[PDB]
RNA sequence: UGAAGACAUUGUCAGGUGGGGAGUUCCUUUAGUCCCUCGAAAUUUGAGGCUAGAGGAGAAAAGUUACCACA
């Protein structure tokens, strides 16, 4: 038994897609967020992972709409400042 | 005679030639006799009283509670609390290290009240080694505001971060810069402090090297380094703000091309700079003239402690107001 | 209703503790209401709101809340056993949000409610006498009076004030309370 | 001064939540408008007000000691300490506490984990392994730790027997000097 | 395995050069110190308190005054 | 505690006095690396002691504070540190 | 047409930082010129400049410890 991150296993395409992938160790690049408002609702989403998943159904999808709201409101600003690059 | 008298004197205390005929000069010859006796004899031992978690009576009564003996020392402090004996260590008591009180010296009080920290003011320290200072000022203005600790040597940041943080304080930042270059990182703040490395003649009980290991060279660099470290700060302050901010100049020495030169060299170059009354209870106030220079008048202002008068180590404060 | 459900509940749970062989098992059992006041001091404020408090050898069977925040109370900040030994911001949080229960209050729960604080203070005294000198006022961070737990709130750096709200409360049998609050106070 | 990414940020309120129960205070807008932001310098995570965070940014990355108060360490697998320099906001508004005698107070100060003949008072709702913030009688903030036994299990061992886990403790800030 | 195998028959051979190279780590830090002794008792032009610098930091300064 | 020393017996070469002087730290103990970190006093352990009160003038008129002093003896087997001073 | 109100706010220069975005593949240790510049000192210093002895696939993660816990 071994750790699958030291295997140099390829990636598959499943039903989750593989995208693009990056190359190992040759100028692999990752990203930057910090957020007010999206991190917020990450505090709202880790206590529900934290105390677990709701057995009302209603607001267990309530707090699922919540981080989807989040992340249509993270997308929409990434899309402005992508915007603001381009101006620039 | 004089000369004798010199030989007598370096002989049997151990001074350097030099610094004690520096030191003979300053002073009436009784009176240079029972400050040697002071300087050299170790001093009280004194307590600040954290603001924030505690206040003086209730930590009073928790350390005699803990066989601590105590006095509340002085009129001039509301924070102070000289200690006399203690069956448990000082560090020991768990009131330390929640940061209930925090051991100082007598002469790291003053140049604080010296100060008039406010609220939501922006503050700074050129030298904060120990940091009893810094933790004094941020008592004052009461968890707010921000202060940039400044330290040139990294070794002493790790006793800074690590007394700042167990006392509480939240809202300094600490940086290793060469306080000559701090005004050109910053600039534009209210009540910057300067407690600038001096020759330490003011406290020789805990450091006895200043006997011999200081001379005619190392009295011309250090008070040269005073005057780059001192038009620094007038060049970093505020001429205007909505709550007027002053410069406190305190420095661990008594010697007279330390303190007194400084002070004229910096309100020569600089007019934008007056000194006024500088809010200490007590003191004696800085010679107008010593050896044929004269500096103008508003030394007088300035306050000089000795070790002899009061059980301190040897100060000078004195506070600057910016014009323009 | 569930006001009053949690208060028959309240009084109940402060009796299990109360019993002898069950305080002797203290060392035999964790009983433990620190969870328990924590919800009594979030309830403070909605137990002050309801005019409901009075209505038509008990301990726990009484109708009203009045005497069911009594008896809560008392064994809150006046406990059978280990009387004295209370931890202080539980009595700084439970006193200064009494003054915000003598405000909202009819006036036979104002009494007993001020009838119960002389008794915690002449027998604590200086462990809540910092917060009406202001002098004895620690000054860490401004107060929060909507927290979820009682140590969450700091009163140490507020001074209590609502006492003079109570002098213009009707005189003739709050403010004799009162002077025996501040008389006892003076007395320690 | 680089601000927590998003990997970065669930790791960081995870085992802050282990220990806090009012998340929402930390994150909160304060009178003057401006609210606690976390930045993180050398690994190591502090927990700032915007303001000053703002105003810290002047300074060279790798020039920079130390800005307001350390919540804790990036570990080099990615997992999160907690020091005791967060414990002044961790004590602030705490989920379960434990009282201990003056005996008992010192071997914390010590380094000792809890022991079942030094508790003082216990708090109820404490399952198998659960954080708490230790304290004296005068509520003084001691340290932090997890508990080792549940409700019933912890009682029925010995008097020798070890109640509350170690974690952190006070008595670090007198090794930094 | 293969890399389990090769200590396998190395074994007691590891343990011998390592006693060797402490030994010979105990034969060159005495023998530096002992340059230090042929140094000062020659010539020397120190300072009044002592350098900061840990060792074979600061012997390597004196040795480069030489 | 019983196996601490906070002074040691220093032999200078030059004016040939030996004296008890404070030790103020463990530089380097040759035999392990660890031993150095804790301060543990061996044979050829160097160790930094307080010189004041010899009172040697060095260069620029100035009065030695701390000096190299190599340890000589063998203090597990005798109760006393021995050293030499390295001047 | 009313309120705030010379507060903000705004823009341009001169800076600090910049683990972020776009491209891209000199410092360290030591000494001297006590020569030049800026400082300081009742005449001598300090800080920069210049010169010469020695070193050099790229924010995703790497080398090391007479160290800790585990196997």
Not at chain 2, 50 to 59: F, P
Not at chain 2, 276 to 299: C, D, I, N, Q, R
Not at chain 4, 150 to 171: K, M, N, W
């Amino acid at each position: 038994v071994y750790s699958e991150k030291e295997l140099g296993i390829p990636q598959l395409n499943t039903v989750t897609p593989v995208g693009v992938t990056k190359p190992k160790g040759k100028k692999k690049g990752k990203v930057f967020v910090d957020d007010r408002e999206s991190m917020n609702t990450i505090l709202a989403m880790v206590e529900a992972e934290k105390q677990g998943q709701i057995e009302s159904k209603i607001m267990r999808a309530r707090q699922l709409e919540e981080i989807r709201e989040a992340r249509r409101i993270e997308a929409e600003k990434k899309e402005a400042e992508r915007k603001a690059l381009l101006e620039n | 005679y004089t000369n004798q008298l010199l030989k007598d004197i370096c002989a049997y205390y151990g001074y350097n030639e030099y610094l004690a005929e520096k030191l003979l000069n300053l002073f009436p010859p009784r009176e240079a006799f029972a400050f040697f006796e002071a300087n050299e004899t170790p001093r009280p031992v004194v307590i600040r009283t954290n603001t924030l978690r505690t206040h003086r009576r209730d930590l009073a009564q928790a350390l005699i509670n803990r066989g601590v003996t105590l006095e509340p020392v002085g009129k001039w402090s509301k924070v102070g609390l000289q200690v006399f004996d203690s069956k448990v260590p000082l560090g020991a008591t768990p009131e330390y290290l929640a940061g209930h009180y925090i051991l100082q010296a007598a002469s790291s009080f003053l140049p604080v009240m010296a100060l008039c920290p406010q609220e939501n003011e922006r503050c700074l320290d050129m030298a904060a080694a120990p940091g009893g200072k810094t933790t004094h000022m941020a008592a004052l203005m009461k968890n707010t505001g921000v202060i940039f600790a400044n330290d040139p040597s990294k070794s002493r940041a790790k006793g800074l971060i690590g007394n700042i943080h167990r006392l509480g304080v939240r809202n300094t930042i600490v940086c290793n810069y060469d306080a000559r270059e701090f005004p050109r990182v910053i600039g534009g703040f209210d009540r910057v402090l300067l407690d600038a490395p001096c020759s330490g003649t003011g406290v020789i009980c805990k450091d006895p090297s200043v006997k011999t290991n200081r001379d005619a060279k190392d009295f011309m660099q250090l008070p040269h380094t005073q005057k780059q470290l001192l038009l620094a700060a007038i060049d970093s302050c505020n001429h205007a703000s909505k709550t007027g901010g002053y410069i406190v100049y305190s420095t661990c020495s008594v010697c007279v091309e330390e303190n007194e030169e400084v002070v004229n060299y910096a309100l020569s170059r600089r007019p934008n700079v007056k000194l006024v009354e500088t809010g200490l209870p007590f003191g004696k106030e800085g010679f107008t003239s010593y050896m044929g220079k004269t500096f103008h008048p508003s030394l007088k202002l300035t306050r000089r402690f000795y070790p002899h008068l009061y059980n301190v180590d040897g100060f000078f404060v004195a506070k600057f107001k910016k014009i323009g | 209703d569930t006001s009053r459900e949690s208060l028959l509940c309240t009084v109940t749970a402060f009796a299990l503790l109360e019993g002898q062989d069950a305080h002797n098992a203290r060392s035999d059992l964790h009983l433990d209401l620190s969870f328990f006041i924590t919800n009594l001091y979030r309830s403070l404020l909605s137990l002050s709101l309801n005019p409901d408090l009075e209505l038509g050898n008990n301990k726990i069977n009484l109708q009203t809340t009045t005497v069911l925040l009594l008896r809560c109370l008392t064994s809150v900040l006046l406990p059978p056993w280990n009387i004295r030994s209370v931890p202080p911001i539980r009595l700084a949080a439970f006193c200064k949000q009494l003054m915000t229960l003598a405000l909202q209050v009819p006036e036979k729960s104002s009494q007993a409610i001020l009838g119960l604080l002389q008794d915690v203070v002449h027998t604590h005294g200086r462990k809540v006498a910092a917060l009406w000198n202001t002098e004895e006022r620690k000054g860490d961070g401004t107060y929060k009076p909507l927290s979820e737990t009682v140590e969450g709130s700091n009163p140490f750096t507020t001074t209590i004030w609502e006492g003079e709200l109570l002098r213009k409360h009707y005189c003739p049998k709050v403010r004799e309370g009162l002077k025996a609050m501040e008389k006892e106070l003076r007395s320690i | 001064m680089r601000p927590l990414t998003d990997q970065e940020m669930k790791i960081v309120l995870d085992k802050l939540a282990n220990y806090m129960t009012d998340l929402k205070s930390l994150i909160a807008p304060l009178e003057d408008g401006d609210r606690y932001v976390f930045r993180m310098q050398k690994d190591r995570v502090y927990y700032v007000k915007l303001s000053i965070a703002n105003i810290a940014t002047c300074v060279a990355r790798d020039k920079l000691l130390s800005l307001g108060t350390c919540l804790g360490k990036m570990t080099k697998s990615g997992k999160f300490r907690l020091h005791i320099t967060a414990l002044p906001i961790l004590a602030q508004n705490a989920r379960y506490k434990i009282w201990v005698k003056d005996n008992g107070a010192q071997p914390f100060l010590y380094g000792s984990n809890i022991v079942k003949a030094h508790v003082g008072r216990w708090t109820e709702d404490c399952p198998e392994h659960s954080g708490c913030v230790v304290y004296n009688m005068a509520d003084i903030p001691l340290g932090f730790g997890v508990t080792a036994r549940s409700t019933a299990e912890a009682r029925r061992l010995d008097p020798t027997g070890i109640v509350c886990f170690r974690q952190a403790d006070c008595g670090e800030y007198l090794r930094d000097e | 395995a293969r890399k389990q195998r090769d200590l396998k028959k190395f074994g007691k051979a590891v343990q011998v050069q390592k006693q060797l190279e402490r030994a010979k780590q105990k034969r060159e830090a005495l023998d530096k110190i002992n340059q230090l002794k042929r140094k000062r008792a020659e010539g020397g032009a120190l300072g009044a308190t002592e350098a900061d610098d840990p060792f074979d930091v600061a012997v390597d300064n004196e040795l480069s005054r030489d | 505690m019983g196996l601490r020393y906070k002074k040691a017996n220093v032999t200078h070469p030059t004016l040939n006095v030996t004296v008890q002087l404070p030790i103020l730290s463990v530089k380097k103990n040759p035999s392990n690396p660890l031993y150095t970190q804790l301060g543990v006093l061996t044979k050829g352990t160097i160790i930094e002691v307080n010189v004041s009160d010899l009172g040697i003038v060095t260069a620029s008129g100035k009065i030695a504070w701390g000096r190299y002093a190599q340890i000589t003896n063998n203090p597990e087997n005798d109760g006393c540190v021995n050293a030499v001073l390295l001047v």
